[PDB]
Write a protein that binds this DNA or RNA. Structure first.
Ligand code: MG
Ligand code: ZN
Lengths: 1322, 613
DNA sequence: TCATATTATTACGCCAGACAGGG
DNA sequence: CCCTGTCTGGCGTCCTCTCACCTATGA
RNA sequence: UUGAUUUGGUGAGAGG
């Protein structure tokens, strides 16, 4: 079964693997994020409720008043989106917050407040999101791009080689909070442990332990295990668990139980450890040279004399043993400092530490953090207890606590946001374990260690900044609060929240201007994952590995769609199937594989879960049950693509598109292209201009439908049904009854956006693709947008291309084009330019909008009214006048009248004017007022009458259970209708019910039309300051010409060189010329062989189209057409499509065959595409030669090209790098102010920067005079250039050079220091 | 305001913005002669406004300057003749935007273009590194009269036919024209007109055009080659060469002095480069300019007549490829069955797997290379006989137009063992080429290997440019300022030998450098060359005949000149045949010639004899 | 409108060059 | 007193094109 | 004596 615009032109779909999961809604990142931001979500997470439950209730410092929260709301926007783009306002909503002030008496923590007050106060306006994922910030339509940043939680990084210049590795460990202070631990090459906070000075790390109220003995209890020396019969024996001897040299005689176990000299092996454990060896008598290097663990004091023997962490000598042995401390605890495993890093750090107690530790930390200003007990304790341990200024989020517990192998995943003692101690323990050998480092490119911020998270963080500023303001006003004479807007202020949130949505590194020239380009700028932005890395610094593709990108980030240039691999684009995790990570779908049978259930994984499992490949042959048909299958285990068994796998890839994105999965035959040319192909495919006549890629991938629907450029039907099709203004859809609400009778009226300006000066235009009285279903398309054709996606157009050298005109990458391409207007794109004119009151009175243009004669008053401003629509070019806008006292009058820029033509399509309340010239301002005034009422009544007509009929329709008397129901016409009483019978309240409808309709229409006139009757609506605001919309129509840039989908760039006549083209023996000749020499080097298979398969597609065009032109009854269409849709191997063609009612075969006579469209999916034998077999169904190559004659000489050439249909696109936006020349005009050199650019009429390497190139020749005029006369020296212009126009090519002006600018800037630079003797 | 990249030195005093300048997208226009370029009419009327004003005021059509500015603002019918009379002999400086060496600013004569795109002669593109994928160039106008003469006499595009970094010609025919020549001068074992005899090259082209022979059909012709064996006198020798039809047609374009054996071979790209080089060394500059143009015209014309496409059938899969892959799969199966039983170590396993996949890769490449280089087997009057193939991708590879062994290898044979960004190789290769489909994992490993290359170029270019900057600012001063420093010291140029076969011969190192003391002939105490002779090609051939050991030659670092380098201790001019002139800045051309290849460079037991002596 | 005058983030990679520390 | 980690400064590609956004305060 | 403001500076994106 198919929908009704699916039976229009059903694309022949190759593809063997049955898809199990359909493509998700391609704009779901932006929409789900911002729907999380604004939503009334009780339990607080996440959203605006999290912000209000963090900041509220505010209580002041015992001020006995506590403003609390109830509920918030967003009212209607005062401007809908279209008039918002027209006017220039933000597309925002007012944020109505209920606030409840309660005020206490004296001594009321528990006492009832003395008075309350509560109001729906107004703070800020937040910009809402349009239904397509965009904002409208100041008239322009912008997009917030999702950031990719390091997750909160600990990271164990190495930096193995570069420091110390000695090959000794370090190991640092960064505890990155979501909000607050950064804490880093790091080794130094003396093997000492150092802490630093916020990249400040370096403190030896155990001072932070001494800041957490840990004595030295507790620290040594933590990071070291005790070795027990017992004072015994002789020589102070040792408890020896045999694990501690692993891998060391036996220094002494190892004997016990009257038996010599291990002698001196040999290293202790694990067999000797087994001997000591089997022989149960713990207590052995040591020599005195064994204890002479060890370190004591805890303190010991001489008991009778009452003083200290040794401090903790003290190495032992023999006389120290003579001190402690004679006192009476029988147990001696020593620190086991294994040189292999258990290193003495904490102990040597304690030897570096200049502190001894907690208080001096806090004083040293306070002298680190805030220097100069003294370190007192209260100040240092408040500093350190609010560094990490308070809920205000340090907060690992839920993501941070999950990563923090996961990297430390904790059991739980939810905990408190602040740190604790045990967390810092665990980070130090894991860092020490990594130094010892056990456990390993983390990498930073691993996408399980890399979170995504999106629109709702970033706007929530900015909103929380605004709320903490307004709570500091509320704490300010409340302690100065006098009661009861204030209500909660003398306390609260709508200014900082609105200021912060407009600061982010206006001027941020991620709220950026939408690339809008293409449905693809909109939908792939909204799905963008940037590494840049605040808190992330920069373009000009880093690096090599963060610009590179890591094995966790499989199915999360597109490997091949990243922009080439200064930021490669920072501006990654998101994959097709990849959602976003609850915590913000990238989870991608996989198919759960319990046993041999691959189950059709899906299950989402992130990269910290994808490593543990074994995940199969998308294309591994499985037949009829899910069993892998091989006994071994390529999978990947832990980022390593390897071959595993038939029955080990736990997951399989869902579909074979899932590695790449929606820009580079529209490229058919992707798997045959090179990676570089697929990158260049996707990046150019974003840049296509919408042509005037949209044309359906013959070789597509089938993802055109999802991109053209999911990007909101087409008018997808909301509720299904039929159609009324007024359409000149709007599509009117009558709704079928099942999808139709009981009240609100209701028919859907779709607004078509006709010719208007895009963000890239292209033309966004919608055209209805459904006729009158034609069924449509829910989700079906109704109006084709820019670059769409019946709901598909038509960026460029499909043309007949020959691969051959043709007389040098396609030399390096150039492209030689027939005249049949430029006669048919099949690339003639439409550009629209907005031009503003304002008459601001700079000085010496205000400027004026009058035709009475001066000095200039009857060459001003022409394309305008009898007395001012461009009329409506003519063929204006360059140097014309659009808006007469000149002042007197500015003879002394002048010409600021905004004219048409140099080189452009066009038609004035629209003139907008919300000017300084007064613009009316003669009486036009109020003349149109009456026109709109009468317009509103007309439609208002019309619509009511339209429904009235439907209701009147409905009244009679229902009039059967309570008066069906046809001759007794046609009484009053426009007066009443029902003069009976149904009462009950079988409930037809229905008459009374419909009576209310009409009664309310007229009653509401009056009020509806009442406000209409009110709105109509007005000067105009805009902001203040600016006075004369005239915007004129030109529309140039640019065709194609030698110098434009065209390109296919594979990376084959080209500058169209010669626009040949039709005759000189290479025609085949049938007679048709070829349209575009490309060059075969690009194909062996640039290894993008997919354009040839697209060429052959498009040739086969148009072969079927020519065959259907013959069978339908030379008209046959529909049996032969349905037989040939059925053969065309069966065609070859096992596919997914076949068709159910004998259910197309003998007319839907014919409408399909009317839409196929330009070529049968073929879906070649991304990595499961059409094989070559099917291309040959499809070329045999059409009557074309199997090789794909036709013999071609030459249009010049009439004689055959030897060795037959390739002709086919490639889908070639016109990129928006047009040659009459690049052509520029300058002889003489205006310059800058500071310098005497020419200005730069094209919009400024400026000259070429003759840069540094060109000066070196002229020095490389003997061009001393060419360089002398190149930097003195042509550029800078003012006397030289005026003398040169007069010398040229006299006929004397001679320069009088002088000295450059910018060098005298250099002399004054150097001399304006204390520097006396001069110019010496003659 | 002083320091930095955007101070006054680097932004307003060393580089300035410039009037009488323009900029637009380039395109080909192959009808041009190589001293002229196409320049649009709109840019031409804007760049030449004062010359047109002066011309209009000379005729007497107008009076005041205003009238002339209204005339060209309206663009009447008479200013286009004025424009063709200000263009005619007035060169312009075309400039591609990343100018690295001095061949990136060249002066042309304009030919006016209906259009908006600069038409640029194709051979000159290999100097600018200019393809036509969206490139842009700037035009500058030499205003004064000394600058017009410097554009014609120093910077003209006919004057830059040798790269200043070496002796190699920079107007080498790039890509379409070598395919047209390689298809033209070739042969096949049977065609129309096999083994017929022709009375000249004129009727060879007449037999090709009328339709009685083929472009490659072996034939005895009678050609008259002019060998100039006397002292400046050209002696005619006429003979019958067993050659083809295409070699005679290409002999109609060769100038007089070159011998016929320069076209008798198959003419790839190295052969056409040494054809233009021998023409420049023998017949000088003007026949080499006109012969470079005739090469380009006949290459484009017969490449158009060739119809040399590319198809899907042209990439011939080896029939032996699948059995090679199965033998490699059996070998990795044996190694992993030893790995389950623990007989071998892990590093030796990884080394054995990379070794057998390298061996299988080389065998697949040899299978496809035999299957492409001699696939054509056509009979002539009897049994079969084999020849080199006319496969399209093989002519695009063998001609040296575009393609190598590696790229044609990746389109037919397996595309090797791609490496992960860890730097170590991956033990499971990409056994599928591009004609067969890559599946998902193989394309992802390919994207590892290609993202690393794009990141390397886009970060390598900054270090390459900063290296050229440091080099031209250490050089910056050094000007050829004498004619002889009057010394006897100079470095000892030997051929360099690393331990393999002799890498760079002495004729590459002592070509065009003036000897320090007089080289003794290797026999005994003979004055073979004198002590201040420039060693051009004739002297270097008389050095190679006598097998001279090593030459003590004068080097720039031994020059005794205070504040500059004398004219003998530099050497040959390198883009001029003679010695360096008194004046020509050699520090800047040297710094550009070292730093300009900075892009092509990368960024990131006992002795066994080989020969017998 | 017309004088008043500066604070609560961190996440480059060498590579010279100068400086306090210690055998 | 001669090595020495450690800290501080100083580099990091040219040319071009499009768009938007610009200090608070205040009797 | 017959006319006028971007360069300044930031941010974002793009081409070769
Ligand atoms: Mg290019
Ligand atoms: Zn010298």
């Amino acid at each position: 079964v198919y929908s009704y615009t699916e039976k229009k032109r059903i694309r022949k779909d190759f593809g063997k693997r049955p898809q199990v999961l359909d493509v998700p809604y391609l704009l779901s990142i932006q929409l789900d994020s911002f729907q999380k931001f604004i939503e009334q979500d009780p339990e607080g997470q996440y959203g605006l409720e999290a912000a209000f439950r963090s900041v509220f209730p505010i209580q002041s410092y015992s001020g006995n008043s506590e403003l609390q929260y109830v509920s918030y709301r967003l009212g209607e926007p005062v401007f809908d989106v279209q008039e918002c783009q027209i006017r220039g306002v933000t597309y925002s909503a007012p944020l109505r917050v209920k606030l409840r002030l309660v005020i206490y008496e004296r001594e009321a923590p528990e006492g009832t407040v003395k008075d309350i007050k509560e109001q729906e106060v107004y703070m800020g306006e937040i910009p809402l999101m349009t239904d397509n994922g965009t904002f409208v910030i100041n008239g322009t339509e912008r997009v917030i791009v999702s950031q990719l940043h390091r997750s909160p939680g600990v990271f164990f990084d190495s930096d193995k080689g570069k420091t110390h210049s000695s090959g000794k590795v370090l190991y640092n460990a960064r505890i990155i909070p979501y909000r607050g202070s950064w804490l880093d631990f790091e080794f130094d090459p003396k093997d000492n442990l150092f802490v630093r906070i916020d990249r400040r000075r370096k403190l030896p790390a155990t001072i932070i332990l001494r800041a957490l109220n840990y004595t030295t003995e507790q620290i040594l209890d933590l990071f070291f295990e005790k070795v027990i020396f017992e004072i015994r019969d002789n020589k102070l024996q040792m408890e020896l668990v045999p694990e501690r001897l692993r891998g060391e040299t036996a220094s002494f005689d190892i004997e016990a139980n009257g038996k010599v176990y291990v002698e001196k000299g040999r290293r202790i092996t694990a067999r000797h450890i087994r001997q000591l454990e089997k022989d149960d060896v713990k207590l052995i008598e040591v020599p005195v040279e064994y204890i002479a290097g060890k370190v004591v663990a805890k303190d010991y004091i001489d008991e009778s004399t009452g003083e200290l023997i040794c401090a903790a962490n003290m190495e032992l000598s023999l006389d120290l043993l003579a001190k402690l042995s004679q006192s009476g401390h029988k147990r001696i605890e020593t620190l086991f400092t294994n040189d292999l495993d258990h290193g003495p890093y904490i102990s040597e750090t304690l030897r570096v530490d200049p502190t001894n107690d907690r208080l001096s530790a806090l004083v040293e930390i306070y002298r680190m953090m805030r220097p100069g200003e003294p370190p007192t007990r209260e100040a240092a304790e408040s500093l350190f207890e609010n560094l990490f341990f308070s809920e205000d200024r340090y907060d690992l989020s839920a993501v941070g606590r999950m990563k923090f517990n996961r990297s430390l192998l904790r059991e739980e995943i939810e905990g408190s946001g602040i740190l604790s003692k045990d967390d810092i101690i665990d980070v130090m323990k894991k860092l020490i374990d990594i130094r010892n050998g056990k456990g390993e480092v983390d990498d930073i490119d691993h996408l399980g260690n890399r979170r995504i911020r999106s629109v709702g998270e970033m706007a929530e963080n900015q909103f929380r900044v605004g709320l903490v500023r307004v709570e500091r303001a509320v704490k300010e006003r409340l302690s100065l609060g006098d009661l009861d004479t204030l209500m909660p807007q003398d306390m609260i202020n709508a200014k900082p929240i609105s200021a912060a949130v407009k600061e982010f949505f206006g001027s941020s590194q991620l709220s950026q201007f939408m690339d809008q020239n293409n449905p693809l380009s909109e939908i792939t700028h909204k799905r963008r994952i940037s590494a840049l932005g605040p808190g992330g890395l920069t373009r000009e610094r880093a690096g090599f590995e963060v610009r590179d593709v890591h094995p966790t990108h499989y199915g999360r980030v597109c490997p091949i769609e990243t922009p080439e240039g200064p930021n490669i691999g920072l501006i990654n684009s998101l994959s097709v199937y990849a959602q976003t995790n609850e915590y913000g990570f990238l989870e991608t779908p996989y198919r759960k594989v319990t046993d041999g049978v691959v189950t059709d259930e899906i299950h989402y994984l992130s990269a910290i879960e994808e490593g543990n499992y074994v995940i199969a490949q998308a294309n591994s042959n499985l037949d009829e049950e899910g069993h892998f048909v091989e006994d071994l299958v390529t999978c990947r285990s832990k980022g390593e693509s390897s071959l595993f068994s038939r029955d080990q796998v736990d997951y399989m890839d869902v579909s074979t598109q899932q590695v790449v994105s929606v820009g580079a999965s529209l490229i058919p035959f992707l798997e045959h292209d090179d990676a570089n040319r697929a990158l260049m192909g996707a990046n150019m495919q974003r840049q296509a201009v919408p042509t005037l006549r949209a044309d359906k890629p013959l070789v597509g991938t089938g993802m055109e439908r999802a991109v053209a629907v999911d990007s909101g450029v087409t008018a997808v039907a909301k509720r299904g049904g039929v159609v009324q099709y007024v359409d000149a203004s709007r599509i009117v859809i009558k709704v079928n009854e099942d999808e139709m609400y009981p009240g609100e009778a209701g028919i859907d009226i779709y607004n078509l956006t006709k010719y208007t300006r895009s963000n890239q000066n292209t033309c966004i235009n919608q055209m209805p693709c459904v006729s009158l009285g034609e069924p449509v279903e829910r989700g079906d398309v109704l109006a084709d947008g820019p670059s769409t054709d019946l709901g598909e996606l038509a960026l460029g157009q499909n043309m007949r291309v020959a691969f051959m050298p043709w007389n040098g005109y396609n030399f390096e990458d150039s492209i030689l084009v027939s005249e049949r391409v430029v006669q048919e207007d099949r690339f003639t794109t439409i550009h629209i330019q907005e031009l503003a004119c304002v008459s601001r009151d700079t000085k010496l009175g205000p400027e004026e909008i009058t035709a009475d243009i001066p000095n200039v004669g009857e060459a001003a008053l022409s394309k305008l009214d009898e007395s001012g401003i461009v009329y409506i629509g003519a063929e204006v070019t360059g140097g014309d006048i659009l808006v007469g806008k000149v002042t007197p006292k500015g003879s002394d009058v002048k010409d600021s009248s905004l004219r048409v820029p140099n080189g452009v033509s066009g038609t004035v399509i629209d003139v907008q004017v919300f000017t300084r309340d007064g613009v009316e010239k003669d009486k036009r301002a109020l003349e149109i007022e009456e026109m709109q005034l009468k317009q509103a009422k007309k439609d208002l009544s019309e619509e009511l009458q339209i429904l009235e007509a439907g209701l009147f009929s409905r009244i009679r329709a229902v009039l059967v259970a309570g008066g069906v008397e046809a001759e007794k129901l046609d009484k009053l016409p426009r007066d009443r209708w029902l003069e009976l009483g149904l009462t009950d019978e079988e409930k037809q309240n229905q008459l009374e019910q419909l009576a209310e409808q009409y009664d309310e309709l007229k009653h509401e229409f009056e009020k509806k039309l009442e406000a209409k006139r009110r709105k109509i009757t007005q000067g105009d609506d805009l902001a203040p300051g600016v006075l004369k605001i005239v915007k004129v919309y030109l529309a140039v129509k640019r065709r194609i010409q030698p110098g434009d840039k065209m390109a296919g989908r594979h990376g084959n760039k080209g500058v169209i060189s010669k626009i040949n006549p039709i005759e000189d083209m290479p025609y085949d023996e049938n007679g048709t010329p070829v349209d575009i000749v490309l060059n075969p020499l690009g194909v062996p080097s640039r290894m993008n062989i997919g354009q040839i298979l697209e060429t052959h398969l498009g040739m086969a597609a148009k072969g079927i189209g020519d065959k259907i065009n013959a069978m339908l032109k030379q008209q046959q009854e529909v049996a032969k057409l349905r037989e040939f269409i059925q053969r065309a849709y069966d065609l070859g191997a096992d596919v997914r499509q076949k068709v159910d063609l004998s259910t197309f009612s003998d007319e839907e075969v014919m409408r399909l065959a009317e839409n196929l006579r330009k070529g049968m469209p073929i879906a070649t999916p991304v990595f499961d595409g059409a094989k070559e034998a099917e291309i040959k077999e499809l070329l045999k169904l059409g009557d074309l030669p199997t090789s794909g190559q036709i013999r071609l004659y030459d249009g010049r000489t009439g004689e055959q090209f030897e060795r037959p050439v390739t002709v086919g249909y490639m889908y070639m696109l016109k990129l928006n790098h047009l040659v009459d936006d690049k052509m520029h020349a300058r002889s003489t005009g205006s310059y800058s102010l500071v310098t005497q050199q020419p200005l730069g650019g094209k919009a400024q009429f400026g000259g070429q920067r003759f840069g540094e390497m060109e000066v070196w190139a002229l020095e490389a020749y003997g061009a001393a005079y060419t360089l002398q005029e190149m930097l003195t006369v042509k550029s800078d020296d003012v006397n030289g250039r005026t003398k040169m212009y007069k010398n040229i126009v006299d006929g004397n090519h001679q320069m009088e050079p002088g000295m450059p002006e910018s060098f005298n600018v250099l002399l004054k800037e150097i001399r304006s220091l204390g520097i006396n630079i001069e110019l010496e003797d003659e | 305001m002083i320091k930095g990249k955007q101070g006054r030195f680097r932004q307003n005093l060393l580089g300035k913005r410039v009037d009488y300048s323009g900029r637009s997208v380039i395109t080909v226009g192959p009808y041009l002669r190589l001293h002229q370029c196409g320049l649009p009419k709109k840019m031409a009327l804007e760049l030449f406004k004062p010359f047109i004003y002066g011309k209009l005021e000379l005729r007497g059509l107008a009076t005041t300057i205003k009238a002339a500015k209204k005339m060209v603002e309206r663009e009447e019918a008479v200013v286009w003749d004025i424009l063709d009379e200000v263009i005619r002999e007035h060169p312009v400086l075309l400039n591609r935007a990343p100018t690295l060496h001095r061949l990136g600013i060249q002066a042309f004569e304009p030919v006016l273009i209906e259009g908006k795109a600069i038409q640029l002669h194709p051979l000159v593109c290999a100097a600018y590194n200019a393809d036509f994928d969206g490139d842009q160039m700037a035009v500058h106008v030499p205003l004064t009269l000394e600058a017009q003469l410097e554009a014609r006499a120093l910077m003209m595009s006919t004057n830059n036919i040798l790269s200043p970094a070496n002796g190699e010609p920079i107007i080498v025919p790039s890509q379409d024209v070598v395919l047209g020549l390689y298809y033209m001068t070739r042969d096949c074992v049977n065609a129309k007109g096999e083994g017929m005899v022709l009375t000249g090259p004129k009727e060879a082209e007449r037999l090709y055009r009328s339709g009685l022979a083929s472009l490659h059909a072996r034939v005895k012709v009678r050609i008259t080659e002019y060998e100039k064996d006397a002292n400046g006198e050209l002696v005619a020798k006429t003979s019958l060469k067993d050659t083809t039809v295409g070699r005679a047609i290409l002999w109609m374009i060769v100038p007089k002095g070159l011998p016929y054996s320069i076209v008798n071979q198959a003419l790839g790209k190295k052969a056409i480069s040494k054809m233009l080089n021998t023409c420049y060394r023998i017949l000088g500059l003007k026949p080499t300019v006109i012969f470079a143009d005739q090469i380009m015209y006949t290459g484009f014309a017969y490449a158009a007549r060739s119809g040399a496409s590319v198809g899907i059938d042209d990439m011939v899969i080896p029939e032996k490829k699948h059995e090679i892959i199965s033998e490699a799969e059996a070998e990795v199966a044996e190694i992993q069955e030893q790995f389950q039983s623990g007989l071998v170590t892990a590093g030796e396993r990884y080394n054995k797997v990379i070794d057998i996949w390298a061996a299988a890769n080389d065998r697949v490449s040899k299978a496809m290379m035999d299957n492409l280089q001699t696939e054509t087997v056509i009979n002539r009057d009897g049994q079969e006989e084999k020849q080199v193939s006319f496969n399209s991708i093989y002519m695009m590879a063998d001609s040296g137009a575009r393609g190598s062994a590696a790229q044609i290898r990746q389109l037919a044979g397996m595309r090797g063992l791609m490496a992960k960004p860890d730097g170590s190789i991956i033990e499971t290769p990409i056994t599928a080429n591009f004609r067969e489909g890559l599946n998902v994992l193989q394309y992802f490993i390919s994207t590892h290997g290609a993202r690393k290359g794009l990141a390397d170029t886009a970060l390598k270019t900054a270090n390459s440019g900063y290296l050229t900057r440091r080099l031209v600012d250490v050089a910056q001063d050094l000007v050829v300022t004498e004619d002889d420093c009057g010394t006897h010291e100079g470095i000892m140029m030997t051929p360099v030998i690393e331990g393999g076969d002799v890498k760079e011969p002495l004729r590459d190192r002592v070509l065009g450098r003036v000897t320090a003391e007089d080289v003794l002939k290797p026999g005994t105490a003979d004055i073979l060359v004198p002590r201040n002779t420039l060693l051009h090609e004739q002297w270097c051939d008389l050095l190679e005949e006598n097998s001279v050991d090593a030459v003590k030659v004068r080097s720039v670092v031994s020059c005794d000149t205070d504040f500059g380098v004398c004219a003998h201790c530099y050497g040959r001019d390198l883009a001029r045949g003679h010695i360096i002139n008194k004046g020509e800045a050699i520090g800047v051309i040297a710094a550009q010639s070292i730093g300009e290849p900075g892009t092509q460079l990368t960024m990131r037991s006992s002795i066994q004899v080989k020969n017998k002596g």
